Write a protein that binds this ligand. Structure first.
Ligand code: NAG
Ligand code: CA
Ligand code: CA
Ligand code: CA
Lengths: 306, 298, 64
């Protein structure tokens, strides 16, 4: 009771400072959310005049003269109406249709099954005072559309990423396909080459035996936080790979990479930052390892001409 | 400096207050954060859109209701797939389907065969962008079963003066015949019948060297003119060249209007010229070529 | 004694509320930034995890 009754007074002032510190932070935040709510009383807007040249997909478009990377209109098949897409016409000979793109966290990626089915986000934006949209936005083309494209014929997949120090690596896949909804958009890939680490087919580098194998994405089904189709078998509604606000991906048990994860600014992040203390976030372990969100990440496809 | 140890019990409960109070404010905040997130799911609104109304051409569409200009999807009878076009509807129910446009030189018209076939440029609701629909598409629209068409060449100089030149039975052929332009007759217009030829005084055959009716399309990588050389490669464009022209709306867009032989290492008259309305050294400020069923042109 | 048990609970509690607040901080940051693609504009801001990180280390240097 000598100094003990001194340790107590120390906590009654320490705890007191924190609790009153936090209560004020709560106030600052409540304020920030109200301003943003006011900014949402109106939307952002784009003026994307549509290019004339068009076709089944970006490869055909570039073969018709479309040589500038921007938003184009494409009709992969005469059944469904034509849709907007972003064409990368410079990266490795061009002709790439962008199916996924992350670059600034302007778009929520933690969505339910239906939005991942139809697609969401912004395809393109207006560039330095111009009538056309030459810069891509953040978007996920949509499972249905991606499946239809990869099945039209041999499709190759190019995955690009950048960290917060400007470093860039890439993952190539000469063969890539995605079945339809009835088959849970099951994914299959092959013929790897790159500098990012074949995380899709071999699972995370820093893992051994079954611990690594369970991080293989190839052959996995697609799951959203409201639709479990992962490699985790159990009745434990807690062990699932995709929790709320988590992205939709070809999760297994659980991942080596997740291009559709939350966009953490700065890169590194801790367990006491993650809503569920799980490794959600633009991850690609085989390069930057676990708990590190990329600054830029994209997925592009192109017909594969042997 | 440490107060009475009887204060503890009180102070212990007071911290418990600002702790539970905080946790509550945190629950209320997390609900507000949910609402905010639900207001940030939509994408940016695009000012440009494409009407759901469709048809064989812009006229077929208007005869269906289309009341305002803007991008539409048409699919001529013998066409494989549908494609986007810029329909022009006026206060009379006329649906002009436009295939060429100039208004600021924001589009380089020096393109090849493929490009001139598939089309280049941009379409827009406000009809404020330059483009070239594409020979193949222009061909499908003007050769639909038994439907005679009419072309109207609307011009404008740098002063708000605007003339026009209408040609009846306008028609463009298939690649097999090099997208050949043909028409039955000049149907009027203060712009003048440039397609018929023009006598510049440079040669006794000028007229013969500058008529466009029956001329095949030509681009630099596909010389189909009536000259020893390459008209298209000289003027740097794609057009129904002869030897070479009297009306060239796909020319180099010279800013201001006036230019001369001091404009090129060979002093070519490669501007948007229409000889019967202005001198071959005066590139227009605007240009627009649109077609519509002939049996509609009053 | 027993009044001491009250403090050993408020220690774990204010640590839980510290982690909970830290997460809410990051959460709000990601959501606010994600409106940039939907709303007229997004509140330009920057998180100060540091202050959060100190109060955590500072609590442990009192929890013992
Ligand atoms: C697999 O993970 C567990 C922890 O989840 C770890 O204890 C074990 O050593 C790992 N297996 C390997 C590859 O050693
Ligand atoms: Ca969400
Ligand atoms: Ca599961
Ligand atoms: Ca020749």
């Amino acid at each position: 009771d000598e100094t003990v009754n001194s340790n107590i007074p120390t906590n009654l002032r320490v705890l007191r400072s924190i609790l009153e510190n936090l209560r004020s932070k709560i106030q600052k935040l409540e304020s920030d959310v109200s301003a943003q709510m006011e900014y949402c009383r109106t939307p952002c807007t784009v003026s994307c005049n549509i290019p004339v040249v068009s076709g089944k997909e970006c490869e055909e478009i570039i073969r018709k003269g479309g040589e500038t990377s921007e938003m184009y209109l494409i009709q992969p098949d005469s059944s469904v109406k034509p849709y907007r897409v972003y064409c990368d016409m410079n990266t490795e000979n061009g002709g790439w249709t962008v199916i996924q793109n992350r670059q600034d966290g302007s778009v929520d990626f933690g969505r339910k099954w239906d939005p991942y089915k139809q697609g969401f986000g912004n395809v393109a934006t207006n560039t330095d005072g111009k009538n056309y949209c030459g810069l891509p936005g953040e978007y996920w083309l949509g499972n249905d559309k991606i499946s239809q494209l990869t099945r039209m014929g041999p499709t190759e997949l190019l995955i690009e990423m950048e960290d917060w120090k400007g470093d860039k690596v890439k993952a190539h896949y000469g063969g890539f396909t995605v079945q339809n909804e009835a088959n849970k958009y099951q994914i299959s890939v092959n013929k790897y080459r790159g500098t990012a680490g074949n995380a899709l087919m071999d699972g995370a580098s820093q893992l051994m035996g079954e611990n690594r194998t369970m991080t293989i994405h190839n052959g996995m089904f697609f799951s959203t936080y409201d639709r479990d189709n992962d490699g985790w078998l159990t009745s434990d509604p807690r062990k699932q790979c995709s929790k709320e606000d988590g992205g939709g991906w070809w999760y297994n048990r659980c991942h080596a990479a997740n291009p559709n994860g939350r966009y953490y600014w700065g890169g590194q992040y801790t367990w006491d930052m993650a809503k569920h203390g799980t490794d959600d976030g633009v991850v690609w372990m085989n390069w930057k390892g676990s708990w590190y969100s990329m600054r830029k990440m994209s997925m592009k496809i192109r017909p594969f001409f042997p | 400096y440490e107060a009475s140890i009887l204060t503890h019990d009180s102070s212990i409960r007071y911290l418990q207050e600002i702790y539970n109070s905080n946790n509550q404010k945190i629950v209320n905040l997390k609900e507000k954060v949910a609402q905010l997130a639900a207001q940030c799911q939509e994408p940016c609104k695009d000012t440009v859109q494409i009407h759901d109304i469709t048809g064989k051409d812009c006229q077929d569409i208007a005869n269906k209701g289309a009341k305002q200009s803007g991008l539409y999807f048409i699919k001529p009878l013998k066409a494989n797939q549908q494609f986007l076009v810029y329909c022009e509807i006026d206060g009379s129910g006329n649906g002009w389907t436009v295939f060429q446009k100039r208004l600021d030189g924001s589009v380089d018209f020096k393109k090849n065969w493929i490009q001139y076939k598939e089309g280049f440029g941009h379409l827009s609701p406000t009809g404020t962008t330059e483009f070239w629909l594409g020979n193949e598409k222009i061909h499908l629209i003007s050769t639909q079963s038994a439907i005679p068409y009419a072309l109207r060449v609307e011009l404008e100089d740098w002063n708000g003066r605007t003339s026009t030149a209408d040609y009846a039975m306008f028609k463009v052929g298939p690649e097999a015949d090099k997208y050949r332009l043909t028409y039955a007759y000049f149907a009027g217009g203060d712009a003048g019948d440039a397609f018929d030829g023009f006598d510049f005084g440079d040669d006794p055959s000028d007229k013969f060297f500058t008529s466009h009716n029956g001329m095949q399309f030509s681009t630099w990588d596909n010389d189909n003119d009536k000259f020893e050389g390459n008209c298209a490669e000289q003027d740097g464009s794609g057009w129904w060249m002869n030897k070479c022209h009297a009306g060239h709306l796909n020319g180099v867009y010279y800013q201001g209007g006036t230019y001369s032989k001091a404009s090129t290492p060979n002093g070519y008259d490669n501007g948007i010229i229409w000889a019967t309305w202005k001198t071959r050294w005066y590139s227009m400020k605007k240009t627009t070529m649109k077609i519509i069923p002939f049996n509609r042109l009053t | 004694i027993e009044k001491v048990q009250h403090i050993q609970l408020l220690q774990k509690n204010v640590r839980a509320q510290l982690v909970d607040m830290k997460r809410l901080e990051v959460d709000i940051d990601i959501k606010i930034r994600s409106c940039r693609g939907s709303c007229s504009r997004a509140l330009a801001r920057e998180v100060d995890l540091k202050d959060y990180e100190d109060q955590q280390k500072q609590l442990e240097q009192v929890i013992a």
